[PDB]
Amino acid sequence: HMGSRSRLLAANAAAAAFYAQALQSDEAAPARQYLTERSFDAAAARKFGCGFAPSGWDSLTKHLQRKGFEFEELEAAGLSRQGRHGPMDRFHRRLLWPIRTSAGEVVGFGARRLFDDDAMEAKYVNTPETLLYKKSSVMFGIDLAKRDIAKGHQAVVVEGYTDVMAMHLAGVTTAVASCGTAFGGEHLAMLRRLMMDDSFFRGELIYVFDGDEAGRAAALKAFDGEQKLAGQSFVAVAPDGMDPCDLRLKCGDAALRDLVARRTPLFEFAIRAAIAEMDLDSAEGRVAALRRCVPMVGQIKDPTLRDEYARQLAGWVGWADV
Amino acid sequence: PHMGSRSRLLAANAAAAAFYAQALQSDEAAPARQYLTERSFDAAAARKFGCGFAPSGWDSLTKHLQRKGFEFEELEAAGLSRQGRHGPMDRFHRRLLWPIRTSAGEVVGFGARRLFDDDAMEAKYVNTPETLLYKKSSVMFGIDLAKRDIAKGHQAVVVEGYTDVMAMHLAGVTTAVASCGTAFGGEHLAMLRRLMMDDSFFRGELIYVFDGDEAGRAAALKAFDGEQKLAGQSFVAVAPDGMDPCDLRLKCGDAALRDLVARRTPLFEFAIRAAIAEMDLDSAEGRVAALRRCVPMVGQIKDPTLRDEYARQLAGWVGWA
DNA sequence: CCGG
């Protein structure tokens, strides 16, 4: 019993319920306000398991001790930690999102700052590295998205928790996000796995970015590795400044479906973005353009995909009929 | 053993290929050189694929290989020689040979084309029979060359003939392969599938290239059969006016072949539109009959996503219904 | 007094 995977999963399960309840308190008011300020209702908050870490030292810790859970289990789960005058909660006075497995089991939490006087000055904090929670492989929204990415042959990587919420609410049920860290290799590996039918990868990685420099960072990065999924990788970028949560407030739910639908392939975006910062209106800047982007084509390892982008260069700079 | 082993048999075929290659430069090998040069294959080409000529006579190669030390038991086992009444004799006579190899380049047999008018063998093409090395249902011409580019490019191009593979490779299509003697089956298909995975998780696009249309029909018919997993990744391309890839190169040059490949169609799309091509789209009552023939076909697609993408376009292909 |  003591400290098993199923025991820790039962603790995090108990903790999520407690935090979910705590969202309906008086001191939780600004946590609810954060949600409703960006158009998330009481239905939405319940759908994603949203909760409030209350004030005090050991609200949760005692709650789980009083329903059987020994402290040594709770520290290994990442819920509590050793304080000077005994045990205490990890999370305090913050809006929480339960981070689940694809099976739907809670392994940890993402917590946002609400109050100015909160000692923890970081904007977001997470459950630390545990047996269950692993930063580099865990994803928010994967429980809900699992079915529709396998069916849809499509994943939509977004930055934040509220960005996953806004996408899923707008119909884009394939949206997910990396929790407290950069999107990575074993995140990719996990999503790739679900999109397999037979022994064949099949689908679309759609990376949604906010701010165009953040998109251009992914662009210049696209040519780096073995370019394993590059052919099936795509970029969409919201109207300058915005993110999927904001886009849904200003321009409604349809604007997200279109943003996702009108994604650009990763290499195309990278190349054409470099052409965008050039003068295509003379013979000099036409040559300067090819002089920088033909090398980018040269780096493409798939000869099939390389030849496709070679064909479209003279079109994009201006030297031929598009 | 020492005599009649696998590596010994490969040595016999390797020798045989070297012998037949040399023989292509002979005087009586004029029409065999003519066959190649007539369809735009120069001396550089002929040496790449290892083209050769089987000489006139009875036991030309066999004697040459017996001088090299090979026993008759080995040469018969290799499918190079055979027992005639007054002694051993060659399998091939007075014919342009191409050696057929493994993916690692090891010669396992030959494909021979009829040249002369007074050839004893009536067949247009002859092959090495079933040996320890030569299995007709898994053997493919050009695989040694295409091996790499099929894996990296994630693309194979299946053509009908030897000259079609040659034409494709000279034209820059370095993913072209061909069946030898029999039609393209599952053991060929299942090998290229294995290959295009790239020792990994990759789906590659398999591109069939047909001369006429009965083949395109036969492939269109077979598109919907049983579990149809690799049918989704299969593609078809057909040359205009019923020409093979070799003659498409002769007349319309190397640019046609590369773009024939580029302008290939999905197998399902080809099959559906082939059926639409046999109906009167002029009247509005014809438009409706066409829609009615095709949603049964679209219905037979087992993948939901493909079906939806094919049911989408069905308006456009009917001429707006 | 070959083989196909």
mmCIF file of C-alpha atoms in Angstrom, chain A residues 8-298:
data_model
loop_
_atom_site.group_PDB
_atom_site.id
_atom_site.type_symbol
_atom_site.label_atom_id
_atom_site.label_comp_id
_atom_site.label_asym_id
_atom_site.label_seq_id
_atom_site.Cartn_x
_atom_site.Cartn_y
_atom_site.Cartn_z
ATOM 1 C CA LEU A 8 -0.139 8.496 -4.910
ATOM 2 C CA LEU A 9 -2.685 8.736 -7.756
ATOM 3 C CA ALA A 10 -5.446 8.404 -5.140
ATOM 4 C CA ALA A 11 -3.836 11.281 -3.144
ATOM 5 C CA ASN A 12 -3.638 13.629 -6.150
ATOM 6 C CA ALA A 13 -7.213 12.572 -6.960
ATOM 7 C CA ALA A 14 -8.291 13.532 -3.432
ATOM 8 C CA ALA A 15 -6.303 16.814 -3.659
ATOM 9 C CA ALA A 16 -7.882 17.879 -6.971
ATOM 10 C CA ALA A 17 -11.385 17.401 -5.512
ATOM 11 C CA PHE A 18 -10.480 19.493 -2.448
ATOM 12 C CA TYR A 19 -9.021 22.294 -4.588
ATOM 13 C CA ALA A 20 -12.061 22.100 -6.927
ATOM 14 C CA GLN A 21 -14.329 22.625 -3.897
ATOM 15 C CA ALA A 22 -12.103 25.437 -2.585
ATOM 16 C CA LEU A 23 -12.867 27.415 -5.782
ATOM 17 C CA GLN A 24 -16.406 28.027 -4.367
ATOM 18 C CA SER A 25 -15.142 29.970 -1.283
ATOM 19 C CA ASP A 26 -15.091 33.701 -0.464
ATOM 20 C CA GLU A 27 -11.273 34.145 -0.477
ATOM 21 C CA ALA A 28 -11.190 32.304 -3.840
ATOM 22 C CA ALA A 29 -13.158 35.218 -5.441
ATOM 23 C CA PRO A 30 -10.191 36.621 -7.492
ATOM 24 C CA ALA A 31 -9.492 33.097 -8.889
ATOM 25 C CA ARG A 32 -13.056 32.928 -10.262
ATOM 26 C CA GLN A 33 -12.686 36.535 -11.481
ATOM 27 C CA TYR A 34 -9.526 35.629 -13.457
ATOM 28 C CA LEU A 35 -11.584 32.950 -15.263
ATOM 29 C CA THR A 36 -14.719 35.017 -15.959
ATOM 30 C CA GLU A 37 -12.561 38.042 -16.970
ATOM 31 C CA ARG A 38 -11.505 35.853 -19.941
ATOM 32 C CA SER A 39 -14.913 34.271 -20.590
ATOM 33 C CA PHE A 40 -14.579 30.902 -18.791
ATOM 34 C CA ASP A 41 -17.859 29.948 -17.044
ATOM 35 C CA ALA A 42 -18.640 27.642 -14.082
ATOM 36 C CA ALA A 43 -19.211 24.800 -16.583
ATOM 37 C CA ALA A 44 -15.779 25.339 -18.161
ATOM 38 C CA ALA A 45 -14.038 25.559 -14.756
ATOM 39 C CA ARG A 46 -15.654 22.239 -13.761
ATOM 40 C CA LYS A 47 -14.771 20.624 -17.133
ATOM 41 C CA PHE A 48 -11.029 21.284 -16.672
ATOM 42 C CA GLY A 49 -11.115 20.537 -12.909
ATOM 43 C CA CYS A 50 -10.088 24.096 -11.961
ATOM 44 C CA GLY A 51 -9.407 24.741 -8.261
ATOM 45 C CA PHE A 52 -8.120 27.279 -5.733
ATOM 46 C CA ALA A 53 -5.230 26.623 -3.338
ATOM 47 C CA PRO A 54 -6.491 28.252 -0.127
ATOM 48 C CA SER A 55 -4.583 30.357 2.388
ATOM 49 C CA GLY A 56 -3.049 28.904 5.534
ATOM 50 C CA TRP A 57 -0.246 26.433 6.156
ATOM 51 C CA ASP A 58 -1.678 22.919 5.858
ATOM 52 C CA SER A 59 -5.327 22.999 4.710
ATOM 53 C CA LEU A 60 -4.897 20.146 2.194
ATOM 54 C CA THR A 61 -2.234 18.233 4.143
ATOM 55 C CA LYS A 62 -4.512 17.695 7.156
ATOM 56 C CA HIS A 63 -7.499 16.951 4.845
ATOM 57 C CA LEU A 64 -5.589 13.987 3.324
ATOM 58 C CA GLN A 65 -4.164 12.843 6.685
ATOM 59 C CA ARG A 66 -7.729 12.781 8.081
ATOM 60 C CA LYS A 67 -8.689 10.504 5.150
ATOM 61 C CA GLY A 68 -5.835 8.038 5.716
ATOM 62 C CA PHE A 69 -2.901 9.415 3.690
ATOM 63 C CA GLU A 70 0.452 9.265 5.517
ATOM 64 C CA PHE A 71 2.761 12.300 5.159
ATOM 65 C CA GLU A 72 5.615 10.303 3.545
ATOM 66 C CA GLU A 73 3.197 9.446 0.708
ATOM 67 C CA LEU A 74 2.131 13.112 0.282
ATOM 68 C CA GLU A 75 5.704 14.472 -0.019
ATOM 69 C CA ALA A 76 6.522 11.869 -2.702
ATOM 70 C CA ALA A 77 3.281 12.798 -4.516
ATOM 71 C CA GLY A 78 4.423 16.468 -4.434
ATOM 72 C CA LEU A 79 1.378 17.852 -2.585
ATOM 73 C CA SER A 80 2.988 18.651 0.789
ATOM 74 C CA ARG A 81 6.480 19.347 2.104
ATOM 75 C CA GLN A 82 8.374 19.430 5.416
ATOM 76 C CA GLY A 83 8.042 22.771 7.243
ATOM 77 C CA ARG A 84 9.695 24.073 10.440
ATOM 78 C CA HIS A 85 6.739 23.392 12.742
ATOM 79 C CA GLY A 86 5.621 20.271 10.836
ATOM 80 C CA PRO A 87 3.931 19.567 7.482
ATOM 81 C CA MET A 88 2.595 22.207 5.060
ATOM 82 C CA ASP A 89 0.946 22.544 1.616
ATOM 83 C CA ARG A 90 3.048 23.193 -1.505
ATOM 84 C CA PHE A 91 0.486 25.504 -3.148
ATOM 85 C CA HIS A 92 -0.958 28.648 -1.516
ATOM 86 C CA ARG A 93 -3.416 31.348 -2.685
ATOM 87 C CA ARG A 94 -3.350 30.425 -6.385
ATOM 88 C CA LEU A 95 -5.631 29.291 -9.214
ATOM 89 C CA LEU A 96 -4.799 25.629 -9.956
ATOM 90 C CA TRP A 97 -5.261 23.408 -13.008
ATOM 91 C CA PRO A 98 -5.057 19.619 -12.451
ATOM 92 C CA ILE A 99 -2.492 18.167 -14.860
ATOM 93 C CA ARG A 100 -3.659 14.659 -15.871
ATOM 94 C CA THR A 101 -2.443 11.591 -17.763
ATOM 95 C CA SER A 102 -4.042 10.540 -21.060
ATOM 96 C CA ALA A 103 -5.968 7.955 -18.957
ATOM 97 C CA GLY A 104 -7.455 10.849 -16.904
ATOM 98 C CA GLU A 105 -5.511 10.307 -13.665
ATOM 99 C CA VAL A 106 -4.229 13.410 -11.852
ATOM 100 C CA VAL A 107 -0.411 13.462 -11.536
ATOM 101 C CA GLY A 108 0.147 17.111 -10.533
ATOM 102 C CA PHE A 109 -0.938 20.748 -10.751
ATOM 103 C CA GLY A 110 -0.178 24.042 -12.485
ATOM 104 C CA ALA A 111 -0.746 27.110 -10.285
ATOM 105 C CA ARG A 112 -1.049 30.797 -11.276
ATOM 106 C CA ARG A 113 -0.213 33.794 -9.095
ATOM 107 C CA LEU A 114 -3.199 35.965 -8.109
ATOM 108 C CA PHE A 115 -2.182 38.297 -5.232
ATOM 109 C CA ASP A 116 0.556 40.994 -5.188
ATOM 110 C CA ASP A 117 1.640 40.221 -1.588
ATOM 111 C CA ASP A 118 2.124 36.481 -2.344
ATOM 112 C CA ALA A 119 5.659 35.481 -1.229
ATOM 113 C CA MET A 120 6.012 33.191 -4.267
ATOM 114 C CA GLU A 121 6.833 35.875 -6.853
ATOM 115 C CA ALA A 122 6.927 33.480 -9.845
ATOM 116 C CA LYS A 123 3.974 33.792 -12.254
ATOM 117 C CA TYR A 124 3.457 30.019 -12.638
ATOM 118 C CA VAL A 125 4.502 27.078 -10.420
ATOM 119 C CA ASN A 126 4.092 23.300 -10.829
ATOM 120 C CA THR A 127 4.206 19.998 -8.954
ATOM 121 C CA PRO A 128 7.907 19.028 -8.752
ATOM 122 C CA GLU A 129 9.570 15.946 -10.293
ATOM 123 C CA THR A 130 7.964 12.808 -8.843
ATOM 124 C CA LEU A 131 7.297 9.165 -9.681
ATOM 125 C CA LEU A 132 4.060 10.347 -11.321
ATOM 126 C CA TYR A 133 4.760 13.921 -12.476
ATOM 127 C CA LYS A 134 7.452 14.362 -15.126
ATOM 128 C CA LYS A 135 7.934 17.937 -16.451
ATOM 129 C CA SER A 136 9.452 16.981 -19.811
ATOM 130 C CA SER A 137 6.660 14.511 -20.800
ATOM 131 C CA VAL A 138 3.458 15.792 -19.100
ATOM 132 C CA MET A 139 0.782 17.781 -21.034
ATOM 133 C CA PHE A 140 -2.322 19.772 -20.008
ATOM 134 C CA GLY A 141 -5.476 18.889 -22.014
ATOM 135 C CA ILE A 142 -4.165 15.467 -23.133
ATOM 136 C CA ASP A 143 -6.935 13.615 -21.252
ATOM 137 C CA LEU A 144 -9.584 15.509 -23.244
ATOM 138 C CA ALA A 145 -7.688 15.629 -26.570
ATOM 139 C CA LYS A 146 -6.551 11.930 -26.765
ATOM 140 C CA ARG A 147 -9.650 10.746 -28.675
ATOM 141 C CA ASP A 148 -9.923 13.611 -31.174
ATOM 142 C CA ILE A 149 -6.177 13.647 -32.074
ATOM 143 C CA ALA A 150 -6.242 9.895 -32.850
ATOM 144 C CA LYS A 151 -9.499 10.272 -34.798
ATOM 145 C CA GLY A 152 -8.650 13.686 -36.268
ATOM 146 C CA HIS A 153 -4.995 12.892 -37.080
ATOM 147 C CA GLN A 154 -4.138 16.300 -35.663
ATOM 148 C CA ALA A 155 -2.614 17.913 -32.568
ATOM 149 C CA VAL A 156 -2.631 21.625 -31.708
ATOM 150 C CA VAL A 157 0.193 22.676 -29.406
ATOM 151 C CA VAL A 158 -0.531 25.936 -27.550
ATOM 152 C CA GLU A 159 1.468 27.797 -24.879
ATOM 153 C CA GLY A 160 -0.682 28.015 -21.735
ATOM 154 C CA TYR A 161 -3.486 26.451 -19.689
ATOM 155 C CA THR A 162 -6.114 29.077 -20.575
ATOM 156 C CA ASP A 163 -5.033 28.744 -24.238
ATOM 157 C CA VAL A 164 -5.908 25.010 -24.089
ATOM 158 C CA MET A 165 -9.218 25.904 -22.417
ATOM 159 C CA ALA A 166 -10.134 28.551 -25.013
ATOM 160 C CA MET A 167 -9.271 26.161 -27.893
ATOM 161 C CA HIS A 168 -11.248 23.221 -26.460
ATOM 162 C CA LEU A 169 -14.245 25.514 -25.775
ATOM 163 C CA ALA A 170 -14.117 26.849 -29.362
ATOM 164 C CA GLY A 171 -14.429 23.270 -30.739
ATOM 165 C CA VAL A 172 -10.689 22.647 -31.212
ATOM 166 C CA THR A 173 -10.700 19.546 -29.007
ATOM 167 C CA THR A 174 -7.234 18.460 -30.215
ATOM 168 C CA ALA A 175 -5.426 21.302 -28.348
ATOM 169 C CA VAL A 176 -2.735 20.669 -25.673
ATOM 170 C CA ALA A 177 0.082 22.484 -23.814
ATOM 171 C CA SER A 178 3.434 21.761 -22.107
ATOM 172 C CA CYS A 179 3.331 22.534 -18.352
ATOM 173 C CA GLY A 180 5.976 24.906 -16.923
ATOM 174 C CA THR A 181 8.568 24.108 -19.600
ATOM 175 C CA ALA A 182 9.408 24.272 -23.295
ATOM 176 C CA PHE A 183 7.718 21.808 -25.630
ATOM 177 C CA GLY A 184 10.196 18.975 -26.181
ATOM 178 C CA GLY A 185 11.187 15.597 -27.595
ATOM 179 C CA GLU A 186 9.222 13.239 -25.343
ATOM 180 C CA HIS A 187 6.197 15.567 -25.654
ATOM 181 C CA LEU A 188 6.508 15.130 -29.451
ATOM 182 C CA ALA A 189 7.105 11.379 -28.982
ATOM 183 C CA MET A 190 3.901 11.017 -26.921
ATOM 184 C CA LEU A 191 1.720 12.902 -29.451
ATOM 185 C CA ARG A 192 3.309 10.973 -32.335
ATOM 186 C CA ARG A 193 2.363 7.662 -30.613
ATOM 187 C CA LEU A 194 -1.374 8.542 -30.404
ATOM 188 C CA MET A 195 -1.528 9.594 -34.101
ATOM 189 C CA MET A 196 -0.254 6.146 -35.279
ATOM 190 C CA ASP A 197 -2.543 3.737 -37.102
ATOM 191 C CA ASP A 198 -0.687 0.548 -38.120
ATOM 192 C CA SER A 199 3.129 1.199 -38.109
ATOM 193 C CA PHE A 200 2.729 4.611 -39.804
ATOM 194 C CA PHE A 201 2.792 8.160 -38.422
ATOM 195 C CA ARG A 202 -0.083 10.191 -39.828
ATOM 196 C CA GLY A 203 -1.349 13.694 -39.101
ATOM 197 C CA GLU A 204 -0.591 17.340 -38.393
ATOM 198 C CA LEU A 205 1.433 19.041 -35.650
ATOM 199 C CA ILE A 206 0.008 22.567 -35.552
ATOM 200 C CA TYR A 207 2.156 24.859 -33.394
ATOM 201 C CA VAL A 208 0.171 27.945 -32.369
ATOM 202 C CA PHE A 209 2.365 30.871 -31.303
ATOM 203 C CA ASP A 210 1.683 34.327 -29.823
ATOM 204 C CA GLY A 211 3.949 37.189 -30.868
ATOM 205 C CA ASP A 212 5.707 36.752 -34.219
ATOM 206 C CA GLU A 213 9.295 36.651 -32.849
ATOM 207 C CA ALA A 214 8.238 33.594 -30.789
ATOM 208 C CA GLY A 215 7.063 32.023 -34.074
ATOM 209 C CA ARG A 216 10.280 33.055 -35.868
ATOM 210 C CA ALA A 217 12.259 31.329 -33.064
ATOM 211 C CA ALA A 218 10.549 28.015 -33.912
ATOM 212 C CA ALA A 219 11.103 28.759 -37.618
ATOM 213 C CA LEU A 220 14.912 29.204 -37.403
ATOM 214 C CA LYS A 221 14.907 26.092 -35.118
ATOM 215 C CA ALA A 222 13.056 23.905 -37.695
ATOM 216 C CA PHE A 223 16.225 23.062 -39.696
ATOM 217 C CA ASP A 224 18.317 21.990 -36.662
ATOM 218 C CA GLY A 225 17.890 18.284 -35.881
ATOM 219 C CA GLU A 226 17.079 15.246 -38.020
ATOM 220 C CA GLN A 227 13.836 17.033 -39.105
ATOM 221 C CA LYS A 228 11.887 13.887 -38.122
ATOM 222 C CA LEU A 229 8.343 15.350 -38.119
ATOM 223 C CA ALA A 230 9.178 18.546 -40.077
ATOM 224 C CA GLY A 231 7.173 17.573 -43.186
ATOM 225 C CA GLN A 232 4.030 17.211 -41.044
ATOM 226 C CA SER A 233 4.736 20.242 -38.811
ATOM 227 C CA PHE A 234 2.729 23.452 -39.231
ATOM 228 C CA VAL A 235 2.656 26.987 -37.812
ATOM 229 C CA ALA A 236 -0.202 29.385 -37.127
ATOM 230 C CA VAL A 237 0.254 32.836 -35.565
ATOM 231 C CA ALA A 238 -2.496 35.073 -34.170
ATOM 232 C CA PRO A 239 -2.908 38.752 -35.191
ATOM 233 C CA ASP A 240 0.187 40.472 -33.784
ATOM 234 C CA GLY A 241 0.348 40.412 -29.956
ATOM 235 C CA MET A 242 -2.604 38.094 -29.301
ATOM 236 C CA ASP A 243 -2.872 34.496 -28.055
ATOM 237 C CA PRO A 244 -5.691 31.841 -28.312
ATOM 238 C CA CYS A 245 -7.359 33.105 -25.095
ATOM 239 C CA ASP A 246 -7.358 36.758 -26.263
ATOM 240 C CA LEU A 247 -8.361 35.887 -29.848
ATOM 241 C CA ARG A 248 -11.493 34.203 -28.438
ATOM 242 C CA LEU A 249 -12.470 37.289 -26.375
ATOM 243 C CA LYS A 250 -12.119 39.899 -29.130
ATOM 244 C CA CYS A 251 -13.107 37.883 -32.229
ATOM 245 C CA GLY A 252 -15.153 34.946 -30.829
ATOM 246 C CA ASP A 253 -14.931 31.150 -31.127
ATOM 247 C CA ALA A 254 -14.951 30.910 -34.951
ATOM 248 C CA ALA A 255 -11.681 32.924 -35.174
ATOM 249 C CA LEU A 256 -9.789 30.080 -33.422
ATOM 250 C CA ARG A 257 -11.075 27.347 -35.785
ATOM 251 C CA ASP A 258 -9.929 29.506 -38.744
ATOM 252 C CA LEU A 259 -6.540 30.301 -37.178
ATOM 253 C CA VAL A 260 -5.974 26.538 -36.797
ATOM 254 C CA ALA A 261 -7.516 25.692 -40.200
ATOM 255 C CA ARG A 262 -5.338 28.263 -42.018
ATOM 256 C CA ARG A 263 -2.025 26.926 -40.670
ATOM 257 C CA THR A 264 1.154 27.221 -42.815
ATOM 258 C CA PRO A 265 3.709 24.386 -43.184
ATOM 259 C CA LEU A 266 6.783 24.964 -40.973
ATOM 260 C CA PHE A 267 9.451 25.268 -43.706
ATOM 261 C CA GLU A 268 7.184 27.444 -45.887
ATOM 262 C CA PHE A 269 6.609 29.786 -42.947
ATOM 263 C CA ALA A 270 10.317 29.917 -42.045
ATOM 264 C CA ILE A 271 11.397 30.627 -45.630
ATOM 265 C CA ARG A 272 8.617 33.111 -46.537
ATOM 266 C CA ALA A 273 9.133 35.006 -43.248
ATOM 267 C CA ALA A 274 12.775 35.584 -44.299
ATOM 268 C CA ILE A 275 11.540 36.809 -47.712
ATOM 269 C CA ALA A 276 9.065 39.133 -45.884
ATOM 270 C CA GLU A 277 12.005 41.133 -44.374
ATOM 271 C CA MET A 278 13.457 41.897 -47.850
ATOM 272 C CA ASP A 279 12.950 44.185 -50.874
ATOM 273 C CA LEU A 280 11.415 42.185 -53.762
ATOM 274 C CA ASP A 281 10.970 45.297 -55.994
ATOM 275 C CA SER A 282 14.344 45.474 -57.846
ATOM 276 C CA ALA A 283 16.972 43.105 -59.337
ATOM 277 C CA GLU A 284 19.331 43.591 -56.335
ATOM 278 C CA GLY A 285 16.974 42.618 -53.493
ATOM 279 C CA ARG A 286 15.585 39.753 -55.619
ATOM 280 C CA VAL A 287 19.129 38.279 -55.704
ATOM 281 C CA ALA A 288 19.771 39.105 -52.020
ATOM 282 C CA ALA A 289 16.567 37.145 -51.195
ATOM 283 C CA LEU A 290 17.619 33.935 -53.002
ATOM 284 C CA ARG A 291 21.148 34.448 -51.655
ATOM 285 C CA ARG A 292 19.779 33.867 -48.101
ATOM 286 C CA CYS A 293 16.824 31.440 -48.611
ATOM 287 C CA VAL A 294 18.344 28.957 -51.126
ATOM 288 C CA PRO A 295 20.697 27.893 -48.265
ATOM 289 C CA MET A 296 17.622 27.351 -46.050
ATOM 290 C CA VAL A 297 16.270 25.058 -48.796
ATOM 291 C CA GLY A 298 19.716 23.380 -49.013
#
